[PDB]
Design a binder for this molecule. Structure first.
Ligand code: HEC
Ligand code: HEC
Lengths: 108, 108
């Protein structure tokens, strides 16, 4: 417990504004710059099929739960150096909380 | 120009999360703790009828445009000392920008 639920409403707009450029969340949604994130929670990193991940992601072999996801979202490259995800990150815990609350929900 | 348009999507969720407790935006929406804000832009402060404003608001006699609104939103009491609006404020310009973009739009 180092993650606490935030707004899904608010989570959804941080997603549209900071993640939608490269990712989809819907089941049957396509890979774009980044992979479709449907069902990511509980999945290891680099396993969406038909997506060309970097050696770094695959290797990090991250098991995604709201907690892992929060550290990563703080600073992706610092978390999986070599990842091709080009997003600086979400420095505020409160934002991370709202977005994860949104993802926890829309990736199911 | 010391105000620039932001996300309405994002503006709408800051509103639900930080302003909805006391205000409505829709035409025909009711006064709650705070007055209904439909049509506020271009209106002076303390003029919604059927609302009991403080002597301070009425007196400040603020003409509301996206700019005034931004200063106020930073620190209400510092802006209209004596106001009964009990909201600390929105310190980040970027947030202020998204919410005003939302209000500019939903209060029309
Ligand atoms: C494009 C500029 C991106 C933005 C903005 C965001 N992401 Fe991303 N993401 C992107 C790429 C290219 C990749 C793969 C990197 C690689 O090394 O292969 C990723 C990866 C993810 C992952 C890991 C998924 C997995 O299946 O292991 C997650 C969980 C993820 N991205 C989430 C995510 C969120 C929530 C974003 C907005 C804050 C976001 N990313 C931005 C590309 C881009
Ligand atoms: C309740 C705890 C409130 C919250 C949260 C917000 N507002 Fe408010 N607002 C509230 C009151 C009691 C009043 C009247 C104060 C008085 O002295 O009479 C106000 C007033 C406004 C105004 C001025 C309206 C006018 O017609 O002159 C505006 C523009 C306004 N409030 C906006 C607003 C926004 C955008 C908020 C969320 C960030 C918000 N307020 C929070 C009560 C409460």
């Amino acid at each position: 417990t180092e993650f606490k639920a935030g707004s899904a409403k608010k989570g959804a707009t941080l997603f549209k504004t900071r993640c939608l450029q490269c990712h989809t969340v819907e089941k049957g949604g396509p890979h774009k710059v980044g992979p479709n994130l449907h069902g990511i929670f509980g999945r290891h990193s680099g396993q969406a099929e038909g997506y060309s991940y970097t050696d770094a992601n695959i290797k990090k072999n991250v098991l995604w739960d709201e907690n892992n996801m929060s550290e990563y979202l703080t600073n992706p490259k610092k978390y999986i150096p070599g990842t091709k995800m080009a997003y600086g990150g979400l420095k505020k815990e409160k934002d991370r909380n709202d977005l994860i609350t949104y993802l926890k929900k829309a990736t199911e």
